[PDB]
Amino acid sequence: SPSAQELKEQGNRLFVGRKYPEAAACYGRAITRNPLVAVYYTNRALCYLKMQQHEQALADCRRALELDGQSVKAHFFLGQCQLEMESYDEAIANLQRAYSLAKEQRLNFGDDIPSALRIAKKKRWNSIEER
């Protein structure tokens, strides 16, 4: 009988091993034990994004944000999901929000957030210029 935290860690390990459906199933088992922990939904959202399930990834970002509105990771993954869905304005605003929250929380992700923002902004510009 694994605990919710053991299942979340098993999910993280499987994600690093590129076993995305198995990792998402582990996060689901963690949610069964404790459905009020935001990171179980944020981490499963990234599995759904890797599995090209954008609507499920969006839904899990929403569940995470209803539990932890200060989540840098929920905003970052939501922006990455929206970028793949071509919802450019929303993607940029969520990535900008992850940047501000990371700065307020003194979290260091190297250049990941500004790099993701430049990628999203360039994709938006090119899509508008080429219609």
How far is Cα 104 from Cα 127, in angstroms, rounded to an integer? 32
Stretch that binds ligand A1I5T, among 29-37, 59-67, 68-76, 80-88 (CB under 6 A): 68-76
Rounded to 5 degrees, what are φ and ψ at 110? 65, -135
Q: How far is the CB of 129 from ligand A1I5T (least distance, A)?
A: 27
Q: Using the rule CB under 6 A, is 102 a contact of ligand A1I5T?
A: yes
Quick one: which segment of 62-70, 86-94, 106-114, 119-127 binds ligand A1I5T (CB under 6 A)? 106-114
C-alpha 55/C-alpha 113 separation (Å) is 23
Phi, psi of 3 (to 5 degrees): -85, 170
Q: Does 20 bind ligand A1I5T (CB under 6 A)?
A: no
Residue 22 found at the interface with ligand A1I5T (CB under 6 A): no
Which residues here bind ligand A1I5T, judged by CB under 6 A? 12, 15, 43, 46, 72-73, 76, 98, 102, 109, 112-113
